[PDB]
């Protein structure tokens, strides 16, 4: 009965040279039972990308909530929300439920359309912002991801090289976690193009 490890799953985000990458596994289970291998944990609102790990009902609920809020933001502001602004919105929304929190580990990723600066961020379940140049990790194999990212990561990687680093970080972390894996998706995000790749991995 630990909300953060009932459904399982992982998200990882990295920065590169004029680009960012965000990736996640596809597993959704009920403890030992694998239920779905199509459960994507990454969503996007305009050009800002959001990955969410943890309790699957909250993953879905928060996606619907941030879609709701970014749509109203766009109508009123007459422009798409930026990653820095969205990060603050995620934090505010999570802390609003301080004593009844969503059991999640969100990860923001994106490129600022004005400055062109690659941006990533992470949060704890009550909204504490973890800003980072290098990488952000989340989920039931976060320890494994921290180890993989710390050793494999280097600064200023090109989109094609960054893809290999983030993919290998996720895959090998997932294979050392029982509640993660069952497929994987990787988003490579450039200033004005986004490539989505499904990875081949072991299905156990």
204 binds Mg ion (CB under 5 A): yes
For the CB of residue 184, give the shortest distance to Mg ion in the complex, in Å.
Answer: 15
Which has the closest alpha carbon to 20: 83, 85, 66? 83
For the CB of residue 41, give the shortest distance to other proteins in the complex, in Å.
Answer: 13
Which has the closest alpha carbon to 70: 49, 56, 52? 49
Sign of CA dihedral 67, 68, 69, 75: positive
What is the edge-to-edge ordering of all strands in the sheet holding 19-25?
135-139, 10-16, 19-25, 184-189, 194-199
Q: Report the C-alpha gap between 55 and 127 in whole angstroms.
A: 16
Q: Which is nearer to Mg ion, 37 or 61 (CB)?
A: 37
Residue 155's binding partner among Mg ion, other proteins, none (Cβ under 5 to 8 angstroms by kind) is none
192 binds Mg ion (CB under 5 A): no
Residue 30's binding partner among other proteins, Mg ion, none (Cβ under 5 to 8 angstroms by kind) is other proteins
Q: Which residues bind other proteins (CB under 8 A)?
A: 7, 28, 30, 33-36, 38-39, 55-57, 60-61, 64-65, 67-68, 71-72, 75, 100
For the CB of residue 160, give the shortest distance to other proteins in the complex, in Å.
Answer: 28
Close Cβ partners of 75 (under 8 Å, ≥ 6 residues apart): none
Which has the closest alpha carbon to 87: 100, 70, 102? 70
What x-and-dash track marks residues 145-184 binding Mg ion by CB under 5 A? ----------------------------------------
For the CB of residue 64, give the shortest distance to other proteins in the complex, in Å.
Answer: 5
């Amino acid at each position: 009965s630990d909300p953060s490890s009932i459904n399982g799953g992982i998200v990882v985000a990295m920065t590169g040279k004029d680009c960012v990458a965000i990736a996640c596994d596809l597993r959704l289970g009920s403890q030992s039972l694998g239920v779905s291998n199509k459960f994507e944990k990454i969503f996007h609102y305009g050009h800002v990308f959001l990955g969410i790990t943890g309790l699957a009902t909250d993953v879905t609920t928060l996606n619907e909530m941030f879609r709701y809020k970014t749509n109203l933001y766009k109508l009123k502001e007459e422009r798409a929300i930026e990653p820095e602004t969205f990060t603050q919105l995620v934090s505010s929304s999570l802390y609003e439920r301080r004593f009844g929190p969503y059991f999640v580990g969100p990860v923001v990723a994106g490129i600022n359309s004005k400055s062109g600066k690659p941006f990533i961020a992470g949060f704890d379940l009550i909204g504490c912002i973890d800003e980072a140049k290098d990488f952000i990790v989340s989920g039931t194999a976060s320890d494994q991801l921290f180890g993989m990212c710390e050793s494999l990561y280097e600064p200023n990687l090109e989109p094609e090289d960054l893809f290999e680093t983030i993919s290998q970080a996720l895959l090998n972390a997932a294979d050392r976690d029982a509640l993660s894996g069952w497929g994987a998706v990787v988003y490579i995000i450039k200033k004005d193009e986004v490539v989505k790749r499904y990875l081949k991995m072991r299905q156990d």
